Each structure stands twice: as C-alpha cells, then as structure tokens.
Design a binder for this molecule. Structure first.
Ligand SMILES: Nc1ncnc2c1ncn2[C@@H]1O[C@H](COP(=O)(O)OP(=O)(O)OP(=O)(O)O)[C@@H](O)[C@H]1O
Ligand SMILES: Nc1ncnc2c1ncn2[C@@H]1O[C@H](COP(=O)(O)OP(=O)(O)OP(=O)(O)O)[C@@H](O)[C@H]1O
Ligand SMILES: [Zn+2]
Lengths: 94, 286, 49, 278, 53, 44, 252, 209
C-alpha cells in the first residue's frame, strides 16, 4: 500500500491494526517464515519489522490502468536518460 | 522444458528459396514448412527441414495440406541420406499464429515425442528475437475443462553448432570482431534501451488495451503474478535505494580505485616510452 | 608484411639426398628413407652446381 | 564451336550442402550430382546441391540412383521449381583436394550426356574461416587440341583464376583440365537476413542480458597486476646505458589495451546501475 | 542394409586383420595386416562370443 | 683459450650409442674435425 | 527384431574405428602430448566430458580417426602373461579339505585375513599389520593345496605365479614383468600374491663369477626393493612357499 | 587485418598437431626438421618462435598437410618414473626417526642449509653441495631417510633404481641415465635421487666375463 521506503517498519501498525502484541510479532513473521511469501529481515535491536520481497496483491485494475506512472515512467525515463547517455556518448560513433 | 535449439541457417536458406517459390507459384503468401531435427537434450540442433506445398482457406482457417506423397517418401529420402536427421516439428511465417497450427502440430505428434512449431521469420525487422519454439503443453486452467493444447511460448534461440564459416565468415565481407569497449556496448545500449523500452510500450499496449478492450486474459494468472516481478523496484519519487548508495560506495570504490591506480600505470605506459621513442625519433633524425 | 604469410602455406620443399647426377639434365635422388628416383632439374640451378 | 570464359553464379545453399556434405561427409570420399540451370554460354548458375544416400561402397559412376533422380525431380515438381541438373559434385575432405582417378573417368562419363558438368572438389577440414577450399574444373579433351585451348574472350577472370594456379597434380593436370570461375552471388536477399539474425542473435540476443562484471575484474586485476612486474622488467631491459640492444623487445602493448577496453567495460559497467535504474 | 553390406565386403578384398583383444565396456581392438591398430567400440556383423582375441 | 681449436666431443659418453650406433665409421666426427679444422677430439 | 539389429549394424557402418594411442604427458588443460601406438606423436584434446584429471601419463586412450582428438580411455594395459596365471586360479573347497594344521589355519589366518576383514583393529591399536610369510617343510605336503584353500576362502583377487617362468632369455624382461604385476597389484586394492619354487628365482648371492644368476640377483633386487618400495603395498599380501628355504637370500 | 593476421596464425593449429623434431636450419625462418613419420623435411618455419630455441633436436609441432614449425616443446615425457609428482613421499624423517642423528644431522647440514643459506657458502666461501653415500646392514632404516627427505622438502626428487639398467639393446641403460641427467640439468638443482648399489657397480673392471 505504501510502495516506497521505510521498509524497516516499526511494529506499531503491526501491534495496532493487525491486533497483535509486541511479543508475538516475531511469531507473526516466523510463522510467515514458514509461509514464505515475505521473508523480512526483522530488526531486533529496535523491534523493527523489515519489509523484503512479498506476494503483493491479486488485482488492482485501477492500478493496471494506474501503473503508467511506473511503466511509462520506466519507459521514457530509462529511454530518455538512455538517450542522455547516448546523447552524451554521441560523437564517439566513430 | 526447452530453453534453446541450435539453428543452422542452411535450411533457413531453403526457407529463402521456398520464399522464392511462393512469390512465383501464386496465391500462397506464407511460407509454411516441416522442421527436421533430433532431440538430444533441452538444447537441440536443427540441421535440415523441408517446406511444404500448403494451402489454407481464409474461410474455416483449419484446412491443412501436408501431402504424404510429400511426407512419407520424402521421409524415405531424408531417412535414406541420414537415419539421424528425422522430423522434430514444423514452421510457418508471420509473427503470431494460424488457426490451423495446433491441428498441424497434432498431425506429426504421432511422429515425434515433441513435435515443435517454430514460427519463422522471412523478413527480419524485429525488436525481440528470431524464430522461437513452442513445445507441447497441457496447461488448461484451474477449471477442469477439456484439455488445452495451444502450444505456449517455450524459449529458443539461434544456436551455432560447428565450423561452417569457410563459407559464412568468408561471406562476411564487411564486419569486424570488436574488442568490446569499442562502441559494441553502445550498440547493445540502443538495442536493449530502445528495443527493450518499445517492448515496454508493447506492455503499455498490454496494460492499457487490456484495461480498454481486453477480456478474460486481462488478469488470467500471470499479470499480478508478474506485477510482483514488476514490484521488484517500481517506486514513486526516486525509489530511495539507501542501501545501494554506500553499497554504491562499495561499488564505485572498486572502479575508481582501479581506474585511479591502474590508469596512473597507463600513464607510465603511454607517457614514458612515448617520450623515449618520441625524442629518439625527434632528435635522432638529425 | 602480413600478407606474405600465404607463402607459409606451400608446405616446404623437403630435403633430397642426391648421390650424383648423370647426363640429359637429370639427377639421381635417393629420397630420405626411400629408393632412387631420377628426376629432371629446375632452371635456377645447374648440372654443374 | 567456340570457347568462352565461363562463370558460376552460385546458390549459397550449394556451398552449404557441400560444407554439410563434407563436414558430416566423413572423409571417406563420396559423390553427388549438381542441380543448377545452364543459363547461357558465358556463365552458368547452380541453384541446388542435393543430398545422396550412404554410398559407403565407392566413388564410382555407378553410384547414381536414377529412381532417386526421377523421384527427386518429382519432389521438385510437387514443390515449386523442377529445375535442371548441370553436373556433379564430389567430396575430397581428406587430402589436398585434387582430381581423383574416378573423376578423370566419371567426369566424361557425366558430361557425355551433359554439356559442361563441371567437377566440384571440397575439403571443409582444411580450415574454419581462413581457407575456403571450393574447387571446380572443366575437362578439356584431346579432341579440342586442334584449336588452341584459349577461350580468353573475357580475361582477368581466368587471369585471377590463373592467379593461384597452385595445386600439385592439378598444376600438372594443366593438360585435360581448365577450371571455371566461381563468384559468390549478390545474396543480400539472404545476406540481409543472415546479417540481421547474425547480429540480432550473436550479441546477447534480446541484448537485455549483460546490461561477470567485477570478480572477472578481480581475477583480471590480479592478472593486471601479476603481469605488471614482468611488464616492467622491460625498462630494466631498456637500461642498456649507451647502446647494447637490437630490436627493443617491445612488450609495451598487450597490457595497455586490456586495461583500456576492459576498464571501459568496468566504468560503463559502473554506469549500468544508473542506466538500468533510471 | 545387406546389399550395401555385401558391397562393403565387395569394395576391395576386405583386408583380413588380427583382433588384439576384446573388451565389453561389444568392443574390440583390431590390428591390421599392415600392423596398424584400430579400436572400435562397435563390433558389427559378428558376435563377441563367436570371436576371441 | 685457443679460440676455435678445441672441440671436446668427449668421445665415450653413451659409448654404445655415440659410437657406431648411427655413426658406424665414426668419421662423422672426422668430418666435423675437418670441416671445423681448428678442433681437438677427446675420448675416455 | 533382427531387421532392427541389422539396422543398428547399418548405422554401425557409419561407426568409425577409433585410434589406439597413449598419453605421453599432459601439457595444458586441453593440450595432451600423446603418441600413436604404431608410430608418431601428437598433441590433441578430449571430447567434452572425458574426465581429463583421470588421464594420467601411461594410460591408453582411443582417439578419433580423422580429427584425432581423444575419444575414450580404457584401463591402461594388461600384459597378458599375467592373464594366463591369474584367472587360471580355480575355486576350491575351503580349509575343511586340509586338517591337522589348525595352528597354521588360525595364526596364518590372523596374519592374512584380518587386515582386509578389519584393518582398524590394527588401527585401534595403531600398529601397521604385517605383510607376508613363508611356508616350508617337505615338498608336496600341500603348500599349494593350502594356497588353494586360501583361494577358496577369500575368493577375490588371486595372483598366483609358478615363479620360475620369469627369465626367458633377456635381462630386464623379467623385471618388467615384475613391475607390471606389481603395478596391477597397485591397481587393485585387495590383491593376493602367491609364489612357489622361489629357489629358481630367489637364489643366493655368492661371489660373482657366473653369468646367469646375476640376473637372479638383479631380479632378486627387484624383489628386495619392490616388496617394500617407497610406497608400501596396500592390501597386497604375499604368500610364499618353497621347498628349500636355506639357499634364499638372508637379506630377504 | 592486423587482427586477421593474428588470429590467422592459429587457425590451422593446436587441434591436430603432429610432432616431429628439429634437425638443422639453413637460413632465416626456413629450416630442416626430421619427423616421427620417419622422413626428413625442409620447410618454411614461423616468425613466431624465438630463433634461439632451436639448438637441439627438440620435440616440435607441425601441421599434417602443410608441415610448418609452429611450436617447439623443449621437454620430452620423462626418464622412467619422474619423481612421483605429488604425495607418495612416505614421511618419517624430520619429526620422527629412531636413531640416525649423525646421518640426519649431516644430511640436514648438506641439503637444507645449502638450499636456503647460500650466502653462508659466500662469506666463508665454501662450495655448493654434491652427492653422498650410506652404508648400513639390512634393517638399519636405510630407505626411510631418503623417503621423507623426499617428503619434507619440495625438491624435484627424481629417483630411479638401476637394476633396470641391464638390458638387451645396446646403450639402453645409458640412454636411461642420460634421460635422468639431462632431465636433471633441465629442471632444478633441488634433489635428484638414485638408490643403486652393491653387486651391480663393483670395482672389478678388468674381467672379460
Ligand atoms: N594340511 C592339509 N590339509 C588338507 N589337505 C592337505 C593338507 N596337506 C596336503 N593336503 C592335500 O595335499 C594335496 C596337495 O597339497 P599341496 O598342493 O599344498 O602340496 P604342496 O604342499 O604344494 O607340495 P609341494 O609344495 O612340495 O609341491 C592337496 O590336494 C590337499 O588336499
Ligand atoms: N629408526 C627406525 N625406527 C623404527 N622402525 C624403523 C626404523 N628404520 C626403519 N624402520 C622400519 O623399517 C621400514 C623401512 O626401513 P628401511 O627400508 O628404511 O631400511 P632398509 O632400506 O630396508 O635397509 P636396507 O635398504 O640396508 O635393507 C620402516 O617402515 C619401519 O618399519
Ligand atoms: Zn569426392
């Protein structure tokens, strides 16, 4: 739901919204270790539940449309900056 | 379970002169033919094939012509020259398919453990790959219907087997082996950047046209499943790879230390004997 | 200088073991480990050579 | 009734079936028939070299299967083009590719029916790219020694066919034999697509494959330090004080340019993070 | 098959040689009457029980 | 210190091979010593 | 079915006689200095998967005919004078056939059979097991018969030599057969040696004035070294039987 | 075309390389080479090989057809056994031996101290070391010392035994010993070993036996 960083999440939304306590969040991921969709490297000096790779969703057709700000972003930005490299690496065409 | 085959362009040049047949025999546009070869492994080689006199009605597209005068006795000739080079599959041109193709596969799956259909290219202008394989698949659904048989995208390649360049690399008459770091890398930059991101534009054709007019394979079973793989790193503002920047100090660490010390060694390389042979050539001229 | 190296592809004229020559511009060559062979000579070398 | 310098407009597939017919054609020598079109007098073209069964008995004039001829041409009839034979091929993959003593019989055994029926000698086991041992000969005879054996009409084609003129018993066989000229056809209808599959294939395919990187450099940097002490023995070898040295023994290169293009690869390899990501 | 195999015997006189030994890793070592050795992993038109070194 | 005139072939080393085996009339040595007329032959 | 076997023979018409050669020495990872057995020398390479580490100089390879690259490697070599006395050995009834030798059966059983059944009781002690023994007495009392009882007992690796057919008329041919037998014994782990009538091949070193048992002195020294060597023999027992054990060498 | 020349040099090489031997050299880059086929040739040889590497009748590489000198191999296979090359060194001599302190002490003085302290042979200026002999009854541990003197240093321990020296063809053992010693002068001044002793090398010279 938040795609961005702070993926080393504190347990606060975990202990709040997922109706769990502080002593069980480890079980909440160690059982999830037996699940294996997410394999976070959970901090234990700060109790921070870290986010690694996941099985994300099932369907967000509003983001099958609204994926343009990532897909076309990737397209014209890796392609445009591709042409910024090749526009810098221009007259070594030789 | 097929990754790749070895493609000899010899009988592809027989697809070239049968591509010369179809331009002068008449109405038949597409070059369709039957692929010889031998399963050795997941990797395979194709050494021969043959191109079929074939017709295809535009109305009820599943009308095949694979004559068995043309099949059996020519398999007796092709068996008679070599017991090894028997059938492995078949081919046709066009990029996508043919409403008859699946049936044409099943005519020769009685002949082969895996009759492959490798859809071929007579006029290469492509952004992706050359001719590519399609193996026998039964993926059906999670539904429990009668068994699906349409032959799915099972990766292949153009492999090069043996010497054969007494002809080929004599017929190069243009090309140079680049010592990579000599523009070949930017050729790959144009082809993967451009030819990858126009395929990304095909993927916005997918993820825009399927939102627009796309039915049931809009989200069959791989779109969200590889929106995971899209969710490696698609994030919003700058994606914030904070590990990757002092990790990048561990990276550019290496390249700038090697370039620094090593290109100072290159300063000895160029500079020193450049001066010696320089001034020998200069003042020893007198 | 590098295009000269097709001359390498002519396998080398092996050493011949001549006892002596006779008349009619011909010699007696006894090949290394083989028998006697009367053959004709080239032009850049002589019977007197 | 007249002699002309000929020419062989070759179908690349001819040489393809010869390199397959000698590459897989195990150097026990074999025999075939050549299937082209007698286009005119001053040229000839080949459009097909077909395959022969396992005649592992002997190169002979009797090795021709005429029902394989008739059924072969019949299979050219049920395909688009029933073209004409123009002669015969054979393979000499073992030795130095010169005209065998059956060729000196089966040549005029074949061209008794044909017009030219030019021989075809091959050896792909000579080289991989450098030597292209294709070979072809026209049997002149003692009937035509009335006239001199000089077509000559267009020259410098047999002047540049005359430019090698070096095969041991063939130089000797200047009697009874004069070769034919073979160019390669302007094959851009296939050389185009061999080019596009050539470079669309042989550099990372889809080319999102390399864009391994740095442990190769690790090993390469240990190379590129481990030779550097013996690369720098040459300035000690340049310390001859006055003069005592012949040719400098120049080991200046082979370690400049390895670092050059290799660390061009290391620095654009350093770019590929900020190139792939954004 | 056997037309061409009679032909193989018919090609020249089909050089009578000596078997040096026979392995079964069916496999045999030939010494020619030119006193030249040729291993084969495939014997051919006889049985290994029929012959001996 | 005779600058050419001492070619110590040592003449007995493989004695059943340097002598007579291949060089029957060991005069191959003597063709050496003539065609290197400053020489000195030694044996054991 | 015979048409399919004949089809396999018709495909075997394509099959090529490979070349008998041997590895002289390995040069690089793919350059192999080998020699054609009937002549010249070459440097070639393997197929793809020929286990080049197992190619050790002195092995035999089969090569391609034309390309001449390495196709296979057999054992090595056998020198079939060894064949006609090793597998010549027949199986027997066990030591029930003999009697009145239970001290010899049991203690000779202790010195022979134990370090192949369990050499680690020796290693629980730590001490190396012994090597071999010598039987004597009157001739024909069943020394050979007792050796055949051992030949019935272990049933594995019996190399039994009559041990007087070694000196043909050459000098080191005897030694070369000794080296070949001891290398075959170095090949197979649980080898058993038996020798009889040692006095025609062991002998005694007197002052040298003769000219035919100096050959037995040098051959005897092939025994003096090559019962010990640098490498000790591993599970290679030596069972010795003679009629006169007086005239053998006290060095032995 | 510079790269074509470079890659061109090795097209027809290194796959099926035949082996002959050098004989003589008339002139620049063209020389005489005998063969392991039995005949002799006078062929054009490469500019590749350093020109001073063709003194002996060295093992050289040639083409089948063209027969061109491309490579020279200065070694040849072995003498007979060639030093066992890895591990068969039986080890019990340095940290384990029962009673040979004179001979262990002297062999140590005469092998190990030469191998490192060459400059102690300089400030006193003494000599390099050479051969040695042992004598002891059968059971004095005669071989053990050589066994792990072979072990505990990394010397090129090319041993033989000389009971194989007596043969049928004439000069054969001499060829063996000169394979040993030209092999010796080839490789290294490390340690090269011959256990060969009494009743083969006796001092009776004058007997026409
Ligand atoms: N102790 C024994 N126990 C059982 N059988 C014996 C015994 N001794 C001899 N025999 C019988 O004697 C026969 C010959 O024995 P064997 O071959 O050992 O004689 P030998 O001791 O080898 O004589 P020699 O060495 O003098 O030729 C055997 O068939 C065997 O059955
Ligand atoms: N000092 C020792 N202490 C214990 N055992 C020894 C000692 N020396 C030798 N041995 C025994 O002898 C074996 C090897 O002895 P070695 O071969 O060195 O003597 P040797 O060479 O046989 O004497 P020789 O050659 O004059 O007959 C060892 O494996 C060990 O069993
Ligand atoms: Zn031929």
């Amino acid at each position: 739901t938040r795609p961005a960083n702070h993926r080393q999440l504190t347990f606060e939304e975990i202990a709040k919204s997922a109706k769990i306590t502080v002593n069980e969040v480890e079980l909440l991921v160690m059982k999830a270790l037996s699940v294996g969709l997410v394999k976070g490297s959970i901090d234990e000096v700060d109790k921070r539940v870290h986010m690694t790779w996941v099985q994300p969703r099932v369907l967000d057709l509003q983001q099958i449309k609204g994926m343009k700000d990532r897909l076309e972003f990737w397209c014209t930005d890796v392609k445009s900056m591709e042409m910024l490299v090749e526009h810098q690496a221009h007259d070594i065409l030789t | 379970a097929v990754q790749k085959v070895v493609v000899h362009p010899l009988v592809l040049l027989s697809v070239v002169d049968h591509f010369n047949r179809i331009g002068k025999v008449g109405n038949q546009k597409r070059v369709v033919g039957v692929l010889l070869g031998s399963w050795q492994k997941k990797v395979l080689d194709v050494s021969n094939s043959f191109a079929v006199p074939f017709d295809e009605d535009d109305k009820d597209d599943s009308v095949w012509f694979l004559d068995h005068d043309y099949l059996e006795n020519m398999y007796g000739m092709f068996k008679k020259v070599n017991a090894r080079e028997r059938i492995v599959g078949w081919y046709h041109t066009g990029p996508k398919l043919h409403k008859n193709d699946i049936a044409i596969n099943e005519l020769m799956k009685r002949y082969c453990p895996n009759s492959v259909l490798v859809i071929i290219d007579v006029k290469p202008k492509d952004l992706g790959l050359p001719t590519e394989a399609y193996i026998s698949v039964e993926e059906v659904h999670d539904d429990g219907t009668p068994t699906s048989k349409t032959f799915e995208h099972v990766t292949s390649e153009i492999g090069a087997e043996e010497a054969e360049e007494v002809g080929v690399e004599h017929l190069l008459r243009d090309i140079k082996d680049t010592t990579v770091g000599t523009l070949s890398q930017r050729i790959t930059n144009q082809v993967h950047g451009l030819k990858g991101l126009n395929s990304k534009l095909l993927d916005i054709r997918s993820y825009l046209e399927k939102v627009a007019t796309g039915k049931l394979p809009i989200n069959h079973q791989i779109i969200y499943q590889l929106q995971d793989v899209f969710n490696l790193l698609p994030d919003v503002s700058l994606q914030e790879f904070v590990k990757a920047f002092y990790l990048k100090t561990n990276d550019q660490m290496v390249v700038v230390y090697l370039a620094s010390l090593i290109r100072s060694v290159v300063a000895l390389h160029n500079l020193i004997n450049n001066k010696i042979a320089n001034r020998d050539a200069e003042k020893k001229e007198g | 200088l590098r295009e000269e190296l097709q001359l390498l592809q002519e396998q080398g004229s092996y050493v011949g073991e001549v006892v002596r020559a006779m008349d009619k511009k011909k010699v007696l060559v006894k090949v290394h480990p083989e028998g006697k062979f009367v053959v004709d000579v080239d032009k850049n070398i002589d019977i007197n050579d | 009734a007249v002699d002309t310098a000929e020419q062989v407009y070759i179908s690349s597939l001819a040489l393809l079936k010869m390199l397959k017919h000698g590459r897989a054609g195990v150097p026990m020598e074999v025999m075939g028939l050549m299937l082209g079109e007698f286009v005119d007098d001053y040229t000839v073209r080949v459009i097909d070299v077909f395959a022969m069964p396992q005649s592992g008995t002997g190169v002979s004039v009797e090795a021709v299967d005429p029902v394989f001829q008739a059924k072969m041409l019949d299979m050219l009839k049920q395909t688009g083009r029933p073209e004409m034979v123009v002669g015969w091929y054979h393979s000499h993959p073992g030795f130095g590719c010169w005209l065998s003593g059956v060729d000196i019989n089966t040549q005029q055994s074949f061209e008794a029916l044909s017009e030219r029926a030019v021989a075809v000698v091959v050896d792909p086991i000579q080289s991989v790219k450098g030597k292209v041992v294709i070979d072809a000969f026209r049997l002149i005879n003692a009937n035509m020694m009335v006239l001199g054996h000089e077509p000559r009409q267009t020259t410098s084609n047999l002047g540049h066919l005359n430019k090698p003129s070096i095969q041991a018993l063939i130089h000797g066989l200047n009697r009874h034999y004069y070769s034919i000229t073979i160019n390669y056809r302007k094959n851009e209808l296939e050389q185009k697509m061999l080019l596009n599959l050539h470079k669309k294939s042989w550099m990372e395919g889809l080319t999102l494959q390399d864009y391994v990187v740095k442990e190769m450099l690790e090993l390469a940097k240990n190379y590129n330090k481990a030779v550097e002490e013996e690369d720098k023995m040459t300035p000690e070898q340049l310390a001859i004080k006055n003069v005592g040295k012949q040719d400098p023994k120049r080991h200046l290169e082979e370690h400049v340019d390895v670092l050059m293009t290799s660390n061009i690869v290391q620095c654009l390899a350093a770019m590929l993070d900020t190139v792939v990501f954004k | 098959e056997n037309s061409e195999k009679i032909k193989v015997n018919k090609t020249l006189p089909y050089l009578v040689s000596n078997v040096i030994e026979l392995l079964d890793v069916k496999c045999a070592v030939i010494k020619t009457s030119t006193r030249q050795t040729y291993f084969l992993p495939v014997i051919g038109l006889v049985d290994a029980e029929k012959l001996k070194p | 210190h005779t600058d050419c005139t001492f070619i110590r072939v040592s003449g007995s080393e493989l004695v059943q091979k340097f002598i007579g085996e291949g060089a029957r009339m060991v005069r191959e040595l003597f063709v050496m010593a003539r065609e290197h007329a400053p020489s000195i032959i030694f044996m054991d | 079915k015979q048409y399919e076997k004949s089809e396999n023979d018709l495909k075997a018409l394509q099959s090529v006689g490979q070349i008998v050669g041997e590895v002289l020495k390995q040069l690089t990872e793919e350059k192999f200095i080998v020699k054609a057995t009937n002549g010249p020398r070459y440097v070639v390479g393997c197929r793809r998967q020929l286990d080049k580490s197992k190619l050790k100089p002195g092995t035999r390879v089969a090569l391609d005919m034309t390309t001449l690259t390495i196709m296979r490697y057999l054992p090595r070599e056998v020198d079939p004078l060894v064949y006609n006395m090793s597998h010549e050995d027949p199986g027997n009834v066990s030591y029930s056939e003999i009697g009145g030798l239970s001290e010899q059966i049991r203690e000779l059983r202790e010195v022979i059979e134990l370090p192949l059944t369990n050499p680690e009781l020796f290693q629980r002690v730590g001490i190396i097991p012994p090597k071999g023994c010598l039987l004597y007495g009157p001739p024909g009392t069943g020394k050979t018969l007792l050796a055949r009882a051992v030949a019935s007992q272990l049933d594995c690796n019996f190399l039994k030599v009559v041990s007087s057919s070694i000196v043909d008329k050459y000098i080191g041919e005897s030694a070369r057969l000794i080296r070949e037998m001891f290398n075959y014994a170095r090949d197979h782990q649980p080898c058993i040696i038996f020798m009889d009538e040692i006095d025609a091949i062991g002998g005694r070193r007197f002052s040298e004035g003769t000219s035919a048992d100096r050959e037995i002195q040098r051959t005897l020294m092939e025994l003096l070294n090559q019962m010990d060597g640098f490498d000790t023999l591993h599970r290679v027992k030596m069972i010795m039987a003679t009629n006169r054990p007086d005239t053998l060498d006290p060095a032995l | 075309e510079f790269l074509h020349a470079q890659e061109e040099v090795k097209r027809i090489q290194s796959i099926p390389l035949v082996i002959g031997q050098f004989l003589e050299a008339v002139d620049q880059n063209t020389a005489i080479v005998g063969s392991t086929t039995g005949s002799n040739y006078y062929v054009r040889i490469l500019s590749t090989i350093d020109r001073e590497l063709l003194k002996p009748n060295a093992s050289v590489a040639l083409h089948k057809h063209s027969n061109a000198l491309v490579d020279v191999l200065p070694p040849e296979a072995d003498s007979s056994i060639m030093m066992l090359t890895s591990d068969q060194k039986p080890d019990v001599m340095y940290a384990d031996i029962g009673g040979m302190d004179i001979q262990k002490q002297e062999v140590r003085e005469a092998v190990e101290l030469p191998l490192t302290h060459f400059e102690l042979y300089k400030q006193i200026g003494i000599d390099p070391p050479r051969g040695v002999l042992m004598y002891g009854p059968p059971g004095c541990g005669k071989t053990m010392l050589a066994k792990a003197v072979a072990h505990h240093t990394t010397a090129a321990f090319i041993r033989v035994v000389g009971s194989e020296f007596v043969q049928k063809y004439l000069g054969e053992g001499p060829r063996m010993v000169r394979d040993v010693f030209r092999l010796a002068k080839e490789n290294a001044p490390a340690i090269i070993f011959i256990d060969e002793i009494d009743a083969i090398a006796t001092k009776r010279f004058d007997a026409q036996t």
